[PDB]
Amino acid sequence: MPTLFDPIDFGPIHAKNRIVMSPLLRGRADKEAVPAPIMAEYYAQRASAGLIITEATGISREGLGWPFAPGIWSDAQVEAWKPIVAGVHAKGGKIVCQLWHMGRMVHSSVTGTQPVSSSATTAPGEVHTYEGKKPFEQARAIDAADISRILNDYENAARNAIRAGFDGVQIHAANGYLIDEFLRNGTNHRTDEYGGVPENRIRFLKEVTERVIAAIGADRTGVRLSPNGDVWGCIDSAPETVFVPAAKLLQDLGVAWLELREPGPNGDFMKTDQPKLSPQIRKVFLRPLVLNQDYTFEAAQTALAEGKADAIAFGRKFISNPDLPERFARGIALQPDDMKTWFSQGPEGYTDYPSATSGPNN
Ligand SMILES: Cc1cc2nc3c(=O)[nH]c(=O)nc-3n(C[C@H](O)[C@H](O)[C@H](O)COP(=O)(O)O)c2cc1C
Structure with a gap:
């Protein structure tokens, strides 16, 4: 039973802690979809993340x-x-x-x-x-x-x-994108081998996952799922019959770790009424399970304390706190993030979030 500051191995990835920076699109590439040098500075500032x-x-x-x-x-x-x-x-x-x-x-x-x-x-x-x-x-x-x-x-x-x-x-298998569109019955109306029964709706995830496993190795393959939210009109009426078997498949295939984004009943951008399947998914995926959404420092410690998760991924807190693991360790209050610069261009609201009292006050 670890804490957020205890190391963890994601396959061959020795992570010095269990504080993960969740995926966050920022739109700082060019029109050819080529990353811009500013992205190097953004990710470097947050390298203390496990x-x-x-x-x-x-x-x-x-x-x-x-x-x-x-x-x-x-x-x-x-x-x-x-x-x-x-x-x-x-x-x-x-x-x-x-x-x-x-x-x-x-x-x-x-x-x-x-x-x-x-x-x-x-x-x-x-x-x-x-x-x-x-x-x-x-x-x-x-x-x-x-x-x-x-x-x-x-x-x-x-x-x-x-x-x-x-x-x-x-692998992005969540958030109502391509793979999630196959997984959930509200958007998968296929009458072939990729629609219908849960096993069929996981077939695209299976075949995607198999290629990636064979491409780079199963020990370097993680997956993100979003089993309970209603994300961009994508919902499954009975998530348990699909997402629990999907996580069992990920286990059997050997994927090194699983992240679950789980909205609750009370949430800003994209919440839900459907309950979280992490407890049920936890019984079938035994390798590192990452939980993500409305986590505070306190709740995150509680999840690791209660054996409910191995690590916790943080999204919005990492936008505004490049030193999130240091503020957690040092009890520093967290910087709020500005939505206006989520998807804007330039360093503003991107690489100019300070880590310490070194800005216009040193
Ligand atoms: C591939 C990918 C890209 C994402 N990009 C963003 C983003 O740009 N902004 C955002 O608020 N959430 C984004 N999310 C959702 C977050 O990663 C995260 O799951 C969610 O924001 C959890 O809320 P939190 O930030 O309070 O932890 C993205 C998720 C995925 C899977």
């Missing part, structure tokens, strides 16, 4: 519709990630790349192709483009040839992640 999970990073032009988000399918993107990773390693940190395919959460003006998903659905609301928000387009239900191509993309992205120096990768 493990960094990078922002969602697109596996392909097709799967990346968020403007100014980074990618990892091309040699140019690889060459740009290299000094970003090296700068975290220079401070002794560890960092994994979150491989992204956005599925239907995409706009054809960005990707160049119609949104693709498990079924031909339209997400509610508005999608970002380089020319402002636009209505979501109806998705195309991908076929077997599409799956094979998308599997190739995942492998090449996972291989490129390792080329860039990453200690591992995290």
Whole structure:
């Protein structure tokens, strides 16, 4: 029964503590999805985190519709990630790349192709483009040839992640994106082998996970799931019958660790009514389980104290607190984060969050 400050091994990744920086897209790449030098400074400032999970990073032009988000399918993107990773390693940190395919959460003006998903659905609301928000387009239900191509993309992205120096990768199977669209029955209306019974709805996750495992090794393969929230219109009516078996599959496949994002009943951006499945998932996935969402320092210590989690990932607190593990250890109050600069451009609200009384007061 450890504390947040006790080390943990995520496969071969020796993490000096159990404070993980959850994935957080910041939109600081260029229009070619190539990371900008400023991203090296952002990740370096937070290298005291036991493990960094990078922002969602697109596996392909097709799967990346968020403007100014980074990618990892091309040699140019690889060459740009290299000094970003090296700068975290220079401070002794560890960092994994979150491989992204956005599925239907995409706009054809960005990707160049119609949104693709498990079924031909339209997400509610508005999608970002380089020319402002636009209505979501109806998705195309991908076929077997599409799956094979998308599997190739995942492998090449996972291989490129390792080329860039990453200690591992995290498969984004959550948040209503491509894989989550297959997992949940509210969005998977397929009548073939990838829809219907829970085993069928996990088949795409299985095949994605198998390629990544075979590409970079199972000990360097983590996954993120979001079993209970209603994220971007993506929900499953009976999550237990799908997500518990999905986590059992991840165990059987040997994935080194699992992160769960679990909204509660009372939450800002994206909450829910469906209860968390971490206790049930905990019984089937025995390797490091990472829990994430509304965690305070106090609740995070409680989860490790109660054997309910191995580590805790922090998102919004790491935006505004580059030294989050030091404020936890030293009892320092935390900096609030400014939403306006979540997805803006430049260092403002990005690399100018101070760590100590060294700003305009030293
Ligand atoms: C790939 C990926 C990218 C994400 N990017 C953001 C982000 O840019 N901003 C944000 O508030 N949450 C983002 N999230 C959700 C957070 O990682 C996290 O799960 C959630 O914010 C938990 O809330 P917390 O920050 O209070 O811990 C992202 C999640 C994933 C999986």
